[PDB]
C-alpha cells in the first residue's frame, strides 16, 4: 500500500521564451521555460554559433505564463511567473549565492471569485505595460488583478470585467498598447458565443474595447470600441510605437485597426464566402490559414509568422506618407519546425521554441521591397511526447560481458508529431567495446605518457618493481632503459610541451627525453615521497610528514625552490591548477592546500602568497566564501567546457563525494583576494563500500572530462553546450585504475584495470550521443509514429505510422451501396486532410527500415491498437508462440456505421537477396478478416485472444488460421485499454473508470468480479506487485495516479462489489504508457512510465516501517527549508479532485543529501533518529533501481 516516487529523466519541451537582462544590465540572455524547469542561455558567437547553458532551476509546480519587468533603481530584471489556480510570484537572480531570490508571492483563491463554478477551464495570463508602469493578471476569465509599480511594489486591487461600461463574457486575448499617457488595455471578447456548426444563424459575434487605467484614482473608462468582427478571431498583436494600432488574427482573415481611421481587412482564401459580412478584399497570391500561428515583430513594420505545418512567412505593413497603413505584403521564406513560441534575440537572430520537436536558432539576412533567407545555427534535443514505448535487447555486446546474471536492456519510444515524428533509443549506462584483454596480476597503478598525440609508453607499478612497455604496432616490454625498474614509482607524466617525461620515485625525481636519462635529483625531506603534482612548468612534491618542495623546468633541467609556508598545521593533500579562462583574477598558476585543522588555502605559484581561505572545509558548506572532523583524502581542480572556461572542484572526504563549481564575485572588501566563490552541485554517487581516484582526460572519442573510479564508476562530461553529464558504468565491476590510450589499433580509446587483474583495451560505441541526460539516438521518420512492438523470436521491431493526404470524396450511406460525392470548389479552396496508415519493420543491427516488408491498409482505415501477443501453439516446448496483432476501424463520419478488422501477423526468416543482408525477414499474414463492429482494444489471456468489439468483449481460439468464439460479456460505453494477469482481465473505459473480470476455463464462462462505481477519465492502466498484494494503477486526465485494491472483507466494499482506493499522488504530467521490471526485494517489481512532456518516472513499493520513518523526514524537510518561488511542496503533490496519501516524494527527499553534516545531524536529532539510518534507507532505494 506504500510506495516512493522517483524521477529518472527530466522533462523536455519548451513553452515560453523571452530576452531580458537576467544577470546584469550590460548583457541580455535567452530565458526559456517548460512545465517545472527554467533555463538561462548565452550566445557564444566564436566557437560558428552555439547556445551555452548558464543556469537552471526547478519548481514545485507548472509554469502557466512568464514575463519580465525592470523596476526602479534595480540592477537586474525581475521575472513574473504564474502558477495554476491564481498564483503570482516575482523572482530575481541573487549575486553572491548564484541562486534565485523571491521578492513577492500573491494568492487570489477565495471561493467568492469563482461565482459558483467548480471546474476551471481558464489559465492565468500575465501582461506587462511597455513603459513598466503596471502589470495585469486575468484569473478565472472574469477578474483582473492590477499590480502598480513605484519598496518597489504598491498594493494591488481587483477589477470585475462583468461590471464595466460594457459586459465582457468570453475574453479571447488582451494586450497593452504602445503610446498613450496612461496604461491602455485592449480586449477581444465574444458576448454571444457560436461555433462553426451554427454559422448560418449567428455570424458576427466578436467585439473589441480599450480601457484606460488610472492607477491612483482606481478609475477606468472605455475610450474605443468596435462591434462587428468575424466569429473566428484568434489573437491580437500590438504594433510598435511609430505606427501604433493592433493587428488581429482570424482563421481566414487579417485585420488592422486604429483609433482614428477606418478598419482595413483582407481575405486569405475563399472560405470567407457566406460566413462574414465584414468588408474584406482579396489578397492576391496568398492562400493560407492563421488558426494556430505564432508571430513576432522584427522591425517597426515587419513581422515573422510561423504557420501550422512549419511554413515561415514575412509580412510587411505598407504605409502612406503619414504613417497610415494601406496595404499588406506576404512573402514565403522557408519551412521549419512546429513551434510553440518565438522571440528575437539580436539583429539577424531568431529562436523557435518547440514542444513537438527540436528547438532551433535561426539566422536571417536581407537578400541583395526587401527579402530574407533563413538558416539553422543550433538545436536543442527533445524526446518529445512519449506516446508508446517498448523494451528490447541491444544488438551488439562484447563477449566478455555475455555471462552477466543481470539482463541487458534498452528502451525504444515514439516521439514527435507530423513531419517531426521519430523513434528514440535510450540507454542509461555506458557499455565499453572491448578490443583486447590481458592478464597482469600484481599491479596497483598505471600511467600513459605521450612520446601527433599518440601515446608511446605504458608504465605499470608493482609492489617492488616497475614495468615499462612501448605502445606502437605491437606492445613489447623493455628490459634496459633510462627508467627505474628496481622500485615502485609514485607518478609519471609529461613536462614541457610534451617533450620530456618526469618519473617520481620514493627516493628522488628523474627527467627523461626518450629512453635516455638526462638528470637525477635525490630527495631526502626526512620522509618518503607520497604524492606529486605537475603543472605546465611546475612540479610540486609532498613528503609523508607534510614537507613541501617545488621544482621548475629551466632552460632543460630542474631547479629547486623552497616555498615560504607556515607550519601552524600539517599539510595532508594538495593539487596544482593552470587557468586559461581569466576567471581567477585578484595563463596563471595556483596551488590548493588542505591542513589538518580543517582549513583550505589557495596560493600563487611564482610567489607563495595567500589569496583565499576557508575555515571549515571538510563539513561541506553549500557556498564557499573567503574568510581572510571528517578526513580529506584527495582534491582536484579542472577546467572543462569550451576553451576550458568552466573550473570545477572535486573533493573526496570520508566516503562522500563533493562537487563544486566556480563563479565570479567581485567583492569590494580587502585587497589582493581571489574574486571567486564556489557552489555545491547535487548528484547521486555513492562511495560507500596513494592511488588517485579522479583522473582527467581529453579527447576520448572527441570528449573531455573526468573519470571517477571506485565501487561505482562514473563518467563526467562537459561539452561546448555547458551542461554537466554524469553517466554510470556498472558493467564489469569496480575499477581500480584508468588511463587514456590513443593507438593505431585503438583510435582514441582508454585503459582500465578490473578487480580480477584483467587489463582491458576499449573504445566507446559510436552509435549513441553522450551529450544528453541519457545516451540517445534519434531516428527521423518524417511521419507520425503511433505504436511500437518488439518481436522476441525475430529480434525486430514493428511500427505503425501515418501520413496525411488531401481529401477528395465524401462517403454516403443513403443508398443500398455506399456512394461517393466529388468535391467541386474554386481555385482558392483549402482541402481537408486525410490520413493513411502503414506498418513497417525496423532492424536493431542498423536502425533502418527493412525493404519490401511494408503493409498498407485501406483508404479510411485507422489503427486503434497493436500489441505483441502470446498464443497457444502445438509446435513448441512451452505451448506458446509470439505474434503481432492489430485492430482497425473505418472512419467515415457520424452518419455511416463503423466496422473493424483484426490482423494477426508473423515474422519469418527467408533467403536474403543478393547484395542485401537486411532482407532476411518478412511479414506473414495469418488472419485478416472483418468483424461485426469496431475493434478498439486487444489483449491475451492464458493463450487466448481477447478483443473489444463494440460494447462487448470476446475471447477467441486460433487454430489453422481460424478464430473460434468461446465466451462474451456486456461492458460499458467504450473500452480503449485492456491488460491481463494470469486468468484475470483489467479493462478501462473512456468515461466510466475501470472494472475487473475473471475467466473460468472448465465451464468457459466470463464474469465480472468488481468495478469502480464513480466516474473517471482514464488514460492508462497497469499493475503493482509487492509480495502477494495486487494493486491496479490508473492514470488520469487531471494528472493523478491512483491505486485500487479488491478487499471483500472490508465493510466499505459492500461485499466486494466496489474497488477501494488505497494510494494517491499528483504528478504534474500525463502518462500514456507503462512497463515493469524486477528489482536489481524478493518478489517486488518496479513500475516505470513515460510522460507526454518527455520525462521518465517510476514507483517502488516500500515496507510500512520504512515509510513511516521517512514520512517524518519528509515533513521536516517540507517545513524547515526554503523553496524556489516560495512554493509549497506538500500542496503540489496533493490530489486534485478525500486523499489517502500513501506515496512518498523522492525529489524532496533528495534535499537531505544536499545539506552539510552539521545541519544533517541537527535535523536528525529534531526527529529522534540517526543520520546513518536515514542515509542507509535513502541509498537502498537508489541501489535497487539501477536498470537500463
Amino acid at each position: 500500500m506504500y510506495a516512493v516516487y522517483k524521477q529518472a529523466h527530466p522533462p523536455t519541451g519548451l513553452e515560453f521564451s523571452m530576452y531580458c537582462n537576467f544577470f546584469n544590465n550590460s548583457e541580455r540572455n535567452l530565458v526559456v521555460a517548460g512545465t517545472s524547469q527554467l533555463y538561462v542561455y548565452r550566445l557564444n558567437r566564436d566557437a560558428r554559433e552555439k547556445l551555452e547553458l548558464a543556469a537552471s532551476f526547478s519548481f514545485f509546480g507548472n509554469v502557466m505564463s512568464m514575463a519580465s519587468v525592470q523596476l526602479a533603481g534595480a540592477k537586474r530584471d525581475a521575472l513574473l511567473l504564474s502558477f495554476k489556480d491564481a498564483k503570482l510570484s516575482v523572482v530575481e537572480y541573487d549575486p553572491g549565492t548564484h541562486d534565485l531570490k523571491t521578492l513577492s508571492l500573491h494568492y487570489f483563491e477565495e471561493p467568492e471569485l469563482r461565482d459558483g463554478f467548480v471546474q476551471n477551464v481558464h489559465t492565468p495570463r500575465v501582461r506587462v505595460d511597455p513603459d513598466g508602469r503596471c502589470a495585469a493578471m486575468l484569473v478565472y476569465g472574469t477578474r483582473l488583478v492590477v499590480l502598480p509599480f513605484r519598496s518597489s511594489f504598491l498594493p494591488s486591487y481587483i477589477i470585475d470585467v462583468r461590471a464595466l461600461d460594457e459586459k465582457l463574457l468570453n475574453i479571447i486575448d488582451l494586450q497593452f498598447l504602445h503610446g498613450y499617457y496612461e496604461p491602455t488595455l485592449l480586449i477581444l471578447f465574444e458576448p454571444n458565443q457560436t461555433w462553426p456548426g451554427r454559422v448560418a444563424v449567428r455570424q458576427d459575434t466578436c467585439s473589441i474595447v480599450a480601457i484606460s487605467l488610472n492607477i491612483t484614482q482606481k478609475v477606468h473608462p472605455v475610450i474605443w470600441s468596435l462591434t462587428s468582427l468575424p466569429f473566428d478571431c484568434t489573437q491580437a498583436l500590438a504594433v510598435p510605437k511609430p505606427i501604433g494600432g493592433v493587428v488581429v488574427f482570424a482563421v481566414n482573415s487579417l485585420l488592422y485597426l486604429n483609433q482614428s481611421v477606418p478598419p482595413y481587412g483582407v481575405a486569405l482564401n475563399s472560405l470567407t464566402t457566406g460566413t462574414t459580412a465584414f468588408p474584406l478584399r482579396t489578397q492576391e497570391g496568398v492562400r493560407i490559414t492563421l488558426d494556430c500561428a505564432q508571430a513576432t515583430f522584427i522591425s517597426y513594420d515587419k513581422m515573422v509568422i510561423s504557420l501550422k505545418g512549419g511554413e515561415i512567412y514575412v509580412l510587411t505593413l505598407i504605409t502612406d506618407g503619414m504613417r497610415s497603413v494601406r496595404a499588406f505584403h506576404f512573402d514565403k521564406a522557408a519551412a521549419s519546425v512546429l513551434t510553440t513560441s518565438m522571440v528575437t534575440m539580436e539583429p539577424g537572430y531568431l529562436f523557435l521554441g518547440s514542444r513537438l520537436g527540436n528547438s532551433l536558432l535561426l539566422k536571417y539576412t536581407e537578400k541583395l521591397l526587401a527579402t530574407y533567407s533563413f538558416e539553422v545555427c543550433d538545436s536543442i534535443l527533445n524526446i518529445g511526447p512519449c506516446a508508446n514505448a517498448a523494451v528490447g535487447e541491444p544488438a551488439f555486446l562484447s563477449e566478455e560481458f555475455q555471462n552477466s546474471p543481470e539482463p541487458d536492456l534498452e528502451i525504444v519510444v515514439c516521439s514527435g508529431h507530423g513531419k517531426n515524428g521519430a523513434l528514440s533509443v535510450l540507454q542509461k549506462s555506458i557499455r565499453p567495446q572491448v578490443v583486447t584483454t590481458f592478464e597482469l596480476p600484481g599491479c596497483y597503478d598505471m600511467w600513459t605518457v605521450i612520446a601527433g598525440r599518440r601515446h608511446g609508453f605504458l608504465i605499470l607499478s608493482r609492489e617492488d618493481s616497475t614495468m615499462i612497455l612501448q605502445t606502437g604496432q605491437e606492445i613489447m616490454e623493455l628490459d634496459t632503459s633510462g627508467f627505474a625498474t628496481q622500485g615502485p614509482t609514485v607518478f609519471a607524466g609529461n613536462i614541457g610541451d610534451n617533450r620530456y617525461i618526469v618519473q617520481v620515485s620514493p627516493l628522488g625525481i628523474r627527467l627523461l627525453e626518450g629512453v635516455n636519462q638526462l638528470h637525477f635529483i635525490p630527495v631526502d625531506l626526512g620522509a618518503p615521497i607520497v604524492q606529486c603534482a605537475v603543472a605546465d612548468p611546475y612540479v610540486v612534491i609532498m613528503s609523508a610528514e607534510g614537507h613541501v618542495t617545488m621544482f621548475l623546468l629551466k632552460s632543460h633541467r630542474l631547479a629547486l625552490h623552497k616555498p615560504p609556508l607556515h607550519h601552524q598545521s600539517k599539510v595532508i593533500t594538495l593539487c596544482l591548477y593552470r587557468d586559461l579562462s581569466g576567471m581567477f583574477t585578484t595563463p596563471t598558476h595556483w596551488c590548493l592546500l588542505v591542513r589538518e585543522n580543517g582549513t583550505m588555502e589557495i596560493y600563487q605559484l611564482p610567489d607563495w602568497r595567500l589569496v583565499f581561505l576557508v575555515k571549515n572545509f571538510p563539513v561541506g558548506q553549500r557556498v564557499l566564501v573567503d574568510s581572510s572532523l571528517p578526513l580529506v583524502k584527495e582534491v582536484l581542480l579542472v577546467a572543462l567546457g569550451s576553451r576550458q572556461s568552466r573550473p570545477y572542484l572535486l573533493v573526496h572526504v570520508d566516503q562522500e563525494l563533493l562537487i563544486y563549481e566556480a563563479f565570479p564575485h567581485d567583492s569590494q572588501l580587502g585587497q589582493g583576494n581571489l574574486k571567486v566563490r564556489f557552489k555545491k552541485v547535487p548528484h547521486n554517487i555513492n562511495f560507500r563500500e596513494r592511488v588517485a581516484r579522479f583522473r582527467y582526460f581529453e579527447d576520448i572519442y572527441g570528449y573531455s572530462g573526468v573519470f571517477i573510479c571506485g565501487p561505482s564508476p562514473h563518467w563526467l562530461l562537459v561539452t561546448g553546450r555547458g551542461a554537466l553529464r554524469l553517466h554510470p558504468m556498472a558493467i564489469d565491476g569496480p575499477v581500480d585504475s584508468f588511463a587514456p590510450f590513443h593507438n593505431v589499433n585503438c583510435p582514441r580509446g582508454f585503459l582500465y584495470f578490473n578487480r580480477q587483474g584483467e587489463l582491458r583495451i576499449s573504445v566507446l560505441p559510436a552509435y549513441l550521443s553522450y551529450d544528453a541526460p541519457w545516451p540517445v539516438r534519434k531516428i527521423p521518420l518524417r511521419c507520425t509514429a503511433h505504436y511500437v512492438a518488439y518481436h522476441v523470436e525475430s529480434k525486430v521491431y514493428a511500427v505503425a505510422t501515418s501520413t496525411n493526404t488531401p481529401c477528395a470524396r465524401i462517403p454516403r450511406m443513403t443508398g443500398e451501396e455506399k456512394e461517393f460525392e466529388t468535391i467541386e470548389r474554386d481555385e482558392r479552396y483549402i482541402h481537408p486532410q486525410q490520413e493513411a496508415f502503414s506498418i513497417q519493420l525496423i532492424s536493431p543491427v542498423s536502425w533502418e527500415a527493412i525493404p519490401n516488408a511494408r503493409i498498407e491498409l485501406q483508404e479510411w482505415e485507422h489503427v486503434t491498437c497493436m500489441k505483441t501477443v502470446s498464443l497457444r501453439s502445438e509446435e513448441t516446448v512451452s505451448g506458446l508462440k509470439g505474434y503481432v496483432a492489430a485492430g482497425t476501424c473505418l472512419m467515415q463520419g457520424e452518419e455511416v456505421t463503423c466496422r473493424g478488422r483484426i490482423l494477426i501477423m508473423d515474422v519469418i526468416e527467408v533467403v536474403p537477396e543478393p547484395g542485401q543482408p537486411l532482407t532476411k525477414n518478412k511479414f506473414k499474414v495469418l488472419y485478416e478478416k472483418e468483424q461485426k463492429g469496431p475493434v478498439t482494444a486487444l489483449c491475451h489471456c492464458n493463450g487466448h485472444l481477447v478483443s473489444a468489439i463494440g460494447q462487448k468483449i470476446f475471447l477467441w481460439s486460433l487454430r489453422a488460421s481460424e478464430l473460434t468464439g468461446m465466451a462474451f460479456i456486456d461492458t460499458q460505453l467504450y473500452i480503449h485499454q485492456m491488460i491481463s494477469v494470469k486468468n484475470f482481465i483489467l479493462a478501462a473505459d473512456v468515461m466510466k473508470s475501470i472494472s475487473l473480470l475473471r475467466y473460468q476455463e472448465e465451464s468457459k464462462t466470463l464474469s465480472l468480479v468488481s468495478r469502480d462505481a464513480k466516474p473517471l477519465e482514464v488514460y492508462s492502466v497497469d499493475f503493482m506487485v509487492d509480495n502477494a498484494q495486487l494493486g491496479f494503477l490508473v492514470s488520469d486526465r487531471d494528472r493523478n495516479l491512483m491505486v485500487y485494491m479488491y478487499l471483500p472483507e472490508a465493510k466499505e466494499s459492500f461485499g466486494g462489489m466496489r474497488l477501494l482506493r488505497r494510494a494517491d499522488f499528483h504528478v504534474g504530467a500525463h502518462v500514456n504508457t507503462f512497463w515493469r521490471t524486477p528489482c536489481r526485494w524478493e518478489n517486488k517489481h518496479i513500475t516505470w512510465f513515460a510522460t507526454l512532456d518527455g520525462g521518465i518516472g517510476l514507483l517502488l513499493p516500500m515496507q510500512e516501517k520504512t515509510y513511516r520513518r521517512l514520512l517524518m523526514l519528509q515533513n521536516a524537510l517540507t517545513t524547515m527549508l526554503p523553496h524556489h518561488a516560495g512554493l509549497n511542496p506538500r500542496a503540489f503533490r496533493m490530489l486534485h479532485v478525500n486523499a489517502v496519501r500513501n506515496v512518498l516524494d523522492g525529489e524532496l527527499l533528495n534535499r537531505y543529501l544536499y545539506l552539510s553534516t552539521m545541519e544533517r545531524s541537527e535535523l536528525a536529532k529534531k526527529i529522534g533518529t540517526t543520520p546513518d539510518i536515514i542515509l542507509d534507507d535513502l541509498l537502498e532505494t537508489d541501489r535497487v533501481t539501477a536498470h537500463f
Binding site: 512549419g310 605491437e474 606492445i475
Partner: peptide, 14 residues
Amino acid sequence: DLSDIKNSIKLRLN
C-alpha cells in the same frame, strides 16, 4: 527546408 577489429594487439611480454 530548415529543421536540424578484435584481438589485433599482441603483447610480447618478456
